[PDB]
Design a protein around this nucleic acid. Structure first.
Ligand SMILES: [Mg+2]
Ligand SMILES: [Mg+2]
Ligand SMILES: [Mg+2]
Ligand SMILES: [Mg+2]
Lengths: 260, 105, 290, 51, 224, 88
RNA sequence: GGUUCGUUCCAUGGAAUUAACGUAAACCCUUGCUUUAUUUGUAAAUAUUAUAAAGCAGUUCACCUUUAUAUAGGAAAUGAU
């Protein structure tokens, strides 16, 4: 069975100093992750996924429509832990190599900050904001921001459940509506028939999620409240989160090609 | 086994040894079926990517290569005389003809 | 023609993609939660258990006997009952007979004996070869050639031998003895399918060699010396049984080597080699004389 | 091994296959190696010499 | 008497006697086999001796000269009755694939049927309803029918939620741009097409043979 | 209706002829020709269409032999398991 | 039990593992080609009949088909040769 594993740096016992209270992280990870895993176990208690890790379940049950409910709990457990495995007790100084790559793709360090935070609030829904590393066959290593909805997965192997943008507020009769609508049907039609729209390198090495931001309401509506009048809320949660990003780890997992 | 593999159409051809060649060098009466399943391994281990292929697999795979070269017997082409007459030879049951063919009427 | 060259730079990417793919597999994997992996198919080979519990024997289908009709009534002392139209072998009878066999494999290996693990079935080759490595014994995963024990002079005539010592290292000086010496015979045969190869077991009885076999509900228990009542048709039970016996030999070979480093040999020279000693000095006696 | 057959393969160590053109003029004329034109040097590289 | 005589259970006795004395009288015996001292204190076990097997059900107290006394008996438990009753009322409960391969055999250590149907390690199956039924029928002193209803109703409410998740999960995913692959319904029809076509060919071929046979059967030897 | 018996111990379980013998198709066309002659005449016109069919046969090449059937090999495997056993 | 011109080859057997003779292979003549030799043989000749020493060559390749996936077979003036 899947059991809850401890956190990175003793957060369950003390919690981050200026980001999340010890009781908030208790309700965010210990009490919730255990709840998801409890539900996950019951779903794969007598299947082949009984001994498979979360990621293996995230990729195996991506396209199958009868196992969609299993993908949610699996990807939710992965995305949740992925978000806590990148924080640190004290802010870390961004690396020189990484600091130079960000400017080449976003102009400045803060330009990326306001983009991720802006995407979180603009999304207005439970999801995850990802900082993916996309590298095509002949293209250099380039970074970009990607947003995923309730239980979306950034990996290419799970493109069937990326859940990048909503359909209720992005598919209409306007010029942008028709375009978005066409892409929606083109994907469903291609995915069903088995045709792939965008070639992907073997091994899913195209996108490598480096950083994540859990915008789910159960993680911040207690520590930062609703946010009446602009004090606290979801906005302040995203801002404070930027201070605890383990930029050292973000650089290691980035694996940027030596170019300087 | 975790190393990648190359499609069967991209692996260069190799002339592996036959059952008779192995029976001789080993001095054993190897079974044809047991050897057929052993040759599949060599074909499988041969599809590994050359660059990623380790050194041990390379050497052990060289002991199964059949380095036989058939004899070459190419006939000499019939030349044409300076005057344009080519000489062909034919025989039938006792005979030996010699025809000199030239452009004519 | 690029359509035929576009497969090359793809092949040039396999080393890069593989390296990057393996690195990516180390970070993201195992993030979500910890899995309680409590069974792997290839666990009886990578790390076989020292002993087998009632749960290991039951999980390996070691209690599944043959159909009730296809049974040897003599071997009914080990049957627990009947269910699903088959005979259920008592789990407690298998564990007891297995531990007793593991004691025979250890003592025989501890006294410098030659063991032979025999499993002759489609998928019993990796199991027997693995157990032989642990116990430093010989393996056999093919049809037993009739006469390899009673007619060893002819069959095993050209196969080479060697003379070792306390610490199992070669001894130079027995070259002349390794040409008149007759072939060897196993001191203990561990068969994993006594029902199939009865020619091997009969030769052992004729040659006064102890034997260990997995006696199924339809196998005759009078063919081996130490029976291990269990399911021999299950490739998962055979791996566990052979795994336990492999660990026994390994544990026995260790004590033998640990006792040799202290100058305590746990075995005396064999009769055949012993004879070649007194004759050796006899030839040397002529040198002193003449 | 005694009853094993023998595969027919070109033996390139035979003096007939080594030098397809047997004439000394072609061989000793700096064919592959340099300044080995001496006939004795060529023979020593083919036969076992006692002198 | 065709079978050969196996003396494997006496190798130590026979081998030990052959090593007690030397063939050449007057000399000390040579060293014995290296296995003689290994199994010195491990004699074989008694074999070929029919005992009274375990009786898993009370034997007929009325038989005056019963037979099959040395014959193993059938293993019957109280659940066997309940399993048959449940799976007959729910035949399609057998179509649900269930794994019988055991991982470590310790699945029974965490089964406390006093809590409910959902347990650790085992899936929600007809077995969980039987064990839960048996527990209530024993501890809470319930009747076979009463305990059956209770455990049976808890089984439905859990099965309903599992079927509702599949529908709501797919629909929810598509509202945020989630596309899936071919469903089992479409995949099943495509396979029937490939098989039906093969039958069309066979029928077409056979139909031709039958009509051709009729032409040959009728006598058209002379055309007038 | 009783069920099939369990075969006694046999020296070998096998079918005498594994491969079905295919009747020469042109002995059937000849039978038809012999029929026209009797009903009508040896030298008549109604026999032209049938006689040509017989000539078309012997001009056509013989089909290739069918692959050997491996039934006897599988019967030898399951002999002891299907019957009472083997004899001799 | 299959296969093969063949106790040939493969598989298999609760008994097999091997040796000699015959078989097979190889040998002689013959067929194609290569190299050497040119009289007493060859019109000429830059070498092609003949003469005769050695060496190579086949069911080899291609195509079709193929059992138990182990051993292979078919096609015969319109693939090569
Ligand atoms: Mg059995
Ligand atoms: Mg034989
Ligand atoms: Mg002259
Ligand atoms: Mg000539």
């Amino acid at each position: 069975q899947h059991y809850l594993m401890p956190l990175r740096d003793n957060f369950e016992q003390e919690g981050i100093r200026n980001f999340l209270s010890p009781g908030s992280v208790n309700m965010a990870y210990t009490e919730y992750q255990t709840f998801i895993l409890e539900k996950l176990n019951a779903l794969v208690v007598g299947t082949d996924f009984e001994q498979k890790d979360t990621k293996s379940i995230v990729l195996a049950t991506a396209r199958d429509p009868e196992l969609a409910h299993v993908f949610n709990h699996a990807s939710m457990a992965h995305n949740n832990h992925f978000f806590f495995d990148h924080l640190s007790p004290v802010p870390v100084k961004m690396g020189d190599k990484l600091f130079y790559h960000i400017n080449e793709n976003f102009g400045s360090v803060d330009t990326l900050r306001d983009e991720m935070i802006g995407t979180a609030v603009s999304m207005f829904g439970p999801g995850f904001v990802w900082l993916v590393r996309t590298q095509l066959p002949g293209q250099p290593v380039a970074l970009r921001v990607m947003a995923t909805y309730l239980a979306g997965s950034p990996y290419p192997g799970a493109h069937w459940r990326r859940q990048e943008m909503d359909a209720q507020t992005s598919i209409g009769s306007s010029p942008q509506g028709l375009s978005n609508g066409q892409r929606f049907f083109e994907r469903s039609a291609a995915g069903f028939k088995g045709n792939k729209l965008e070639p992907t390198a073997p091994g899913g090495t195209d996108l490598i999620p480096i950083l994540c931001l859990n915008t789910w309401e159960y993680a911040w509506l207690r520590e930062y409240g609703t946010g009446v009048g602009g004090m606290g809320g979801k906005l302040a949660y995203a801002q404070s989160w930027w201070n605890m990003i383990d930029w050292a780890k973000v650089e290691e997992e980035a694996r940027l090609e030596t170019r300087i | 086994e975790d190393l990648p593999v190359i499609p069967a159409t991209a692996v260069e051809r190799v002339a592996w040894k036959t059952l008779e060649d192995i029976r001789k060098e080993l001095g054993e009466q190897v079974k044809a079926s047991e050897f057929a399943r052993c040759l599949a391994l060599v074909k499988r281990l041969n599809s590994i990517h050359p660059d990623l292929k380790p050194q041990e697999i390379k050497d052990v795979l060289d002991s199964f290569r059949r380095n036989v070269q058939p004899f070459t017997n190419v006939a000499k082409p019939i030349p044409i005389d300076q005057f344009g007459r080519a000489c062909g030879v034919g025989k039938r049951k006792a005979s030996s003809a010699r025809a000199f063919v030239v452009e004519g009427t | 023609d690029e359509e035929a060259l576009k497969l090359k730079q793809q092949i040039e990417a396999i080393p890069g993609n593989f390296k990057l793919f393996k690195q990516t597999k180390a970070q993201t994997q195992k993030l979500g939660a910890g899995v309680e992996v409590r069974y792997i198919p290839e666990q009886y080979l990578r790390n076989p258990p020292s002993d087998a519990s009632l749960e290991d024997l039951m999980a390996a289908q070691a209690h599944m006997g043959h159909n009730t009709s296809l049974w040897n009534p003599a071997n009914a002392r080990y049957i627990y009952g009947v269910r699903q139209g088959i005979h259920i072998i008592s789990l407690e009878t298998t564990a007891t007979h297995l531990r007793r066999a593991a004691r025979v494999v250890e003592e025989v290996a501890y006294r410098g004996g030659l063991i032979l693990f025999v499993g002759t079935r489609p998928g019993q080759r990796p199991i027997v070869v693995r157990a032989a490595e642990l116990a430093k014994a010989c393996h056999l995963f093919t049809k037993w050639r009739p006469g390899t024990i009673t007619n060893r002079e002819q069959l095993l005539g050209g196969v080479p031998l060697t003379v070792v010592d306390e610490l199992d290292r070669p001894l130079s000086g027995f070259e002349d003895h390794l040409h008149d010496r007759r072939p060897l015979a196993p001191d203990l045969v561990v068969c994993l399918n006594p029902k199939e190869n009865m020619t091997l077991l009969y030769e052992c009885s004729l040659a006064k060699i102890p034997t260990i076999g997995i006696i199924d509900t339809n196998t005759n228990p009078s063919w081996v010396t130490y029976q291990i009542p269990a399911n021999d048709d299950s490739l998962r039970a055979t791996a566990l049984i052979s795994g336990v016996l492999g660990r026994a030999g390994e544990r026995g070979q260790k004590r033998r080597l640990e006792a040799a480093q202290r100058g305590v040999v746990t075995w005396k020279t064999p009769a055949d080699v012993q004879g070649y000693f007194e004759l050796a000095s006899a030839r040397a006696a002529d040198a002193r004389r003449r | 091994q005694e009853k094993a057959s023998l595969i027919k393969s070109v033996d390139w160590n035979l003096l007939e296959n080594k030098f397809k053109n047997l004439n000394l003029s072609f061989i000793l004329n700096d064919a592959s190696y340099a300044e080995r034109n001496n006939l004795s040097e060529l023979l020593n590289k083919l036969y076992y010499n006692v002198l | 008497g065709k079978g050969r005589i196996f003396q494997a259970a006496k190798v130590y006795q026979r081998a030990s006697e052959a090593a007690a004395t030397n063939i050449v009288s007057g000399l000390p015996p040579r060293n014995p086999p290296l296995w003689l001292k290994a199994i010195e204190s491990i004699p074989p076990a008694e074999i070929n001796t029919r005992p009274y097997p375990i009786q898993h059900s009370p034997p007929n107290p009325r038989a005056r000269k019963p037979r099959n006394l040395f014959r193993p008996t059938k293993i019957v438990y109280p659940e066997d009755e309940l399993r048959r009753d449940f799976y007959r009322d729910h035949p399609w409960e057998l179509a649900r694939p269930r794994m019988i391969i055991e991982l470590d055999g310790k699945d029974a250590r965490f089964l406390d049927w006093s809590k409910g149907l959902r347990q650790r390690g085992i899936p929600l199956s007809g077995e969980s309803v039987v064990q839960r039924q048996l527990w209530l029928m024993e501890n809470q002193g319930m009747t076979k029918q009463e305990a059956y209803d209770k455990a049976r109703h808890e089984f439905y409410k859990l099965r309903q939620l599992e079927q509702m998740e599949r529908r709501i999960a797919v629909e929810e995913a598509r509202m945020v741009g989630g596309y899936f692959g071919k469903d089992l319904l479409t995949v099943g029809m495509e396979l029937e097409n490939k098989t039906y076509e093969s039958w069309k060919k066979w029928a077409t071929t056979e139909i031709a043979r039958q009509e051709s046979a009729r032409a040959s059967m009728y006598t058209n030897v002379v055309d007038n | 209706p009783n069920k099939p018996i369990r075969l006694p111990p046999l020296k070998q379980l096998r079918v005498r002829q594994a491969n079905k013998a295919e009747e020469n198709p042109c002995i059937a066309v000849m039978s038809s020709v012999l029929a026209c002659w009797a009903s009508a005449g040896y030298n008549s016109a109604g026999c032209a269409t049938v006689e040509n069919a017989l000539r078309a046969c012997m001009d056509a090449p013989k089909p290739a032999p069918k692959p050997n059937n491996t039934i006897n090999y599988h019967l030898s495997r399951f002999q002891e398991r299907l019957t009472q056993g083997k004899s001799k």
